[PDB]
Design an enzyme around this catalytic site. Structure first.
Site, PDB file in Angstrom:
ATOM      1  N   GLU A  11     107.889  43.513  14.038  1.00 45.55           N
ATOM      2  CA  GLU A  11     107.152  43.872  15.224  1.00 45.55           C
ATOM      3  C   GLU A  11     105.710  43.422  15.211  1.00 45.55           C
ATOM      4  O   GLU A  11     105.113  43.269  16.248  1.00 45.55           O
ATOM      5  CB  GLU A  11     107.126  45.417  15.343  1.00 45.55           C
ATOM      6  CG  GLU A  11     108.495  46.039  15.580  1.00 45.55           C
ATOM      7  CD  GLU A  11     109.159  45.692  16.888  1.00 45.55           C
ATOM      8  OE1 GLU A  11     110.325  45.904  17.116  1.00 45.55           O
ATOM      9  OE2 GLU A  11     108.388  45.131  17.759  1.00 45.55           O
ATOM     10  N   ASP A  20     105.355  42.616  25.420  1.00 41.31           N
ATOM     11  CA  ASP A  20     106.374  42.323  24.454  1.00 41.31           C
ATOM     12  C   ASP A  20     107.189  41.078  24.840  1.00 41.31           C
ATOM     13  O   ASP A  20     106.914  40.419  25.836  1.00 41.31           O
ATOM     14  CB  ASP A  20     107.165  43.575  24.115  1.00 41.31           C
ATOM     15  CG  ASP A  20     108.232  43.996  25.091  1.00 41.31           C
ATOM     16  OD1 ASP A  20     108.973  44.939  24.942  1.00 41.31           O
ATOM     17  OD2 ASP A  20     108.352  43.225  26.099  1.00 41.31           O
TER      18      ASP A  20
END
Length: 164
Positions: A11, A20
């Site tokens: 991540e 994202d």
């Protein structure tokens, strides 16, 4: 290697609101803020999450705090889920980390949707399950991360991450 280090690799860490891979407003270590297009809706969720006026920015400590909550909630979610729990219980420690990773990325519901793959993991048919997991939007959209997770389920070792 542990779940935290694994997820930190997948991540990343960002201290300012970002979008994202799917275009959603996120912060810290993969903490989704909102699926809403409004940066303002994002800033509001952020402040609500941290308990302060952040003005779109957080500290390392705040990011790690959110991360601890998210990992905890992912684990508890698996344990409460009738489809997931039995799989998790059947797995060894490393493979358990691979399932947690999927749940953190895609939510309980999404993973519970992988019916056939879950069945194969439960049966310990490693090679077959890796092949089935790859036939998904997940794999096509984030192939490098998916491959890492898939290798983890396939081998039961941390090889895919010992590189990184």
């Amino acid at each position: 290697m542990n779940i935290f280090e694994m997820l930190r690799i997948d991540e990343g860490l960002r201290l300012k609101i970002y979008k994202d891979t799917e275009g959603y407003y996120t912060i810290g270590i993969g903490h989704l803020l909102t699926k809403s297009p409004d940066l303002n809706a994002a800033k509001s969720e952020l402040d609500k999450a941290i308990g302060r006026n952040c003005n779109g920015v957080i500290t390392k400590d705040e990011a790690e705090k959110l991360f601890n909550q998210d990992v905890d909630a992912a684990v508890r979610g698996i344990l409460r889920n009738a489809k997931l729990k039995p799989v998790y219980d059947s797995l060894d420690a490393v493979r358990r980390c691979a399932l947690i990773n999927m749940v953190f990325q895609m939510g309980e519901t999404g993973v519970a949707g992988f019916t056939n793959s879950l069945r194969m993991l439960q049966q310990k048919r490693w090679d077959e399950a890796a092949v089935n997991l790859a036939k998904s939007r997940w794999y096509n959209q984030t192939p490098n991360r998916a491959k890492r997770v898939i290798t983890t389920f396939r081998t039961g070792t941390w090889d895919a991450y010992k590189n990184l």
